[PDB]
Design brief:
It is found in: Cell inner membrane. Belongs to the methyl-accepting chemotaxis (MCP) protein family. This is HAMP domain-containing protein. By secondary structure, the protein is an alpha+beta fold. It folds into two domains: about 130 residues, no CATH class; about 110 residues, no CATH class. The chain contains seven helices and eleven strands. The strands form two sheets. Strands 1, 2, 3, 4, 5 and 6 form a six-stranded antiparallel sheet that branches. A hairpin with a 2-residue loop joins β9 and β10. The protein is elongated and about 70 Å long. The relative contact order is 0.16. It binds glutamine.
Length: about 240
């Protein structure tokens, strides 16, 4: 009975190493948003706000870096054509940073300017006590998925980012973004947890593991790993 399933050890290690890569990837990028939010606290004048958002280290980092203020003032670099009714305080990155009260990440949404799926690192900007706005920075979803799948598999498996309640955040399949884990596998579903789960894909049988992304205070995000069950048993010696 050679039913030794190290596959179980492989999935839960690849899941944590991938989670650590995403954990380390957001390190510097959250650091850039915080340093910007802390700098706009001591001076948020329009001339200083303009030149603060034009530094090249933010240009090569985020698609858009911006500050939405409590009175509705909006400043963003690079400049883009936004809807006429654009109000930053009614945007998800404003509510996410406000409701979280700290540096947080938004669920993927549709960029209004370039019409591409993005994620925002939004941090509240406070002069101490009362806040005056929210600093944000957009990350292209195609860039994020590549970090999720930085580790190589044998074409048997892929990695994706799913939230705690089961909402898929980034997935290599562009149409399955923001779908629920229940919406993907109709036959009764896997659930986030320690255990491995077995479900069926489109003409394929998959095994799923879940390793949480630590370090993100307040965000219970998990790195999911679907692997082709039959393909997964590549035996050695
Ligand atoms: N032009 C911009 O800076 C857009 C900001 C961001 N994409 C938003 O959803 O508001």
């Amino acid at each position: 009975a050679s039913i030794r399933e190290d596959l179980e050890d492989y999935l839960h290690e690849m899941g944590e190493i991938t989670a650590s890569n995403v954990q380390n990837w957001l390190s510097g990028r959250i650091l850039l948003i915080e340093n910007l939010a802390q700098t706009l606290a001591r001076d948020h004048s329009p001339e200083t706000t303009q030149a603060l958002l034009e530094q090249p280290l933010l240009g090569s980092t985020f698609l858009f870096t911006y500050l939405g203020q409590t009175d509705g003032t909006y400043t963003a670099r690079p400049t883009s054509d936004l809807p006429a009714d654009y109000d930053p305080r009614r945007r998800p990155w404003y509510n996410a940073a406000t409701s979280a009260g700290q540096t947080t990440l938004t669920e993927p949404y549709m960029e209004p300017a370039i019409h591409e799926l993005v994620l925002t690192i939004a941090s509240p900007a406070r002069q101490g006590g009362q806040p005056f706005g929210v600093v944000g920075g957009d990350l292209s979803l195609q860039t994020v998925v590549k970090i999720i799948n930085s580790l190589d598999f044998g074409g048997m498996g892929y990695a994706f980012l799913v939230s705690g309640d089961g909402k898929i955040l980034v997935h290599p399949d562009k149409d399955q973004v923001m779908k629920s884990l229940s919406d993907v596998y109709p036959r009764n579903t896997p659930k986030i947890g320690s255990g491995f789960s077995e479900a069926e894909l489109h003409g394929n049988t998959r095994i799923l593991s879940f390793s949480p992304v630590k370090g993100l205070s307040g965000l219970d995000w998990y790195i999911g790993i679907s692997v082709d069950k039959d393909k997964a048993y590549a035996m050695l010696t």
